[PDB]
Amino acid sequence: KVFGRCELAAAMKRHGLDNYRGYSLGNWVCAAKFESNFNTQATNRNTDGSTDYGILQINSRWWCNDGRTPGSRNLCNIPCSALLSSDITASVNCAKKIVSDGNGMNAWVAWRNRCKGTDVQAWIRGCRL
Template identity: 35%
Template sequence: MARRIVIIIYTLAIFFNAFGIYGKVYTRCGLVKELLNMDFSRSFIGNWVCLIESESGKNTSSIKYKANRSQGLGIFQIRSKDWCTFHRKGGICNVRCEDMLDENITDDATCAQKFGFRAWDGWKRNCKGRKLPLPLC
C-alpha cells in the first residue's frame, strides 16, 4: 500500500513538472504585499483578499470544475469558459488558461481587475456587506 502511494505521488510530480505547473499558497500578508505591489487599490485590498480566500484558499494552482464544463483556475479562479483559452492566448483576457496556474499571478491579476471583485460569486457569498479592512501585517 505504501509503495502504491509513493508511485501515485511520483506520477503526479512528473505530471505537474511536465506541464510546468508550479503553484504557491500565499500567506495573507504575502498576498496583501503582492497585490499592493501590483497597484491594487489599498482601499479595496480587503475585498480582493476575501475573494481570493473564498475562491482558491490563496492557492495559485487551484482548479475547480464547474457544472457548465468550465474550470475556475488559479488564485482568482479565472473562468476557462470565457476569460482564457487552453493551449493558446484567448478569451476576454487574452491569456492561456495554463498560465493561470503558475506562481506568477501578474497575468491573473490583470485579468481579474478587468472584471472587479463584484463579478465573483465567492465574493458575493462570503465578502459582500462585510467590513473588510486592510489586513494587518
C-alpha cells in the first residue's frame, strides 16, 4: 500500500510516534518519505546479504528474521514479511525499539541525509492531525 502523506501522518500519530523520544511527527513522516516513499512493500537488498523492509526500511541483519541473512538476530521478534503489511503497527513498534538503540533516528540513513537539521514541520503541512 502507498500512503498519502497526511494519511501516514495520522497513522503514525495514532501509534504514538509524535515526539516519541523527542522526535516530532515531522521527523518520522520525513524518514518514511525518503526511506520508502510511503510504500509499505518497499524492499532494498544490501550488498552485505541483508535486506531493508517496509515503510521504514528495517534491516534483516538485526531487527527481523527473513531466514536468509547470515548471523542475523531477531531483536524485534518478528518475520520481516510482517513489516511489508498495509498496517504499520509492526513497523512502528519495531522502530520504537531501534530509535531507543543508542543512535536516535541516525539509525535511518535517509533520515540523516535528508531530514536531520531540516524544517521537518513542513512534512505535516495541510494535515488535520
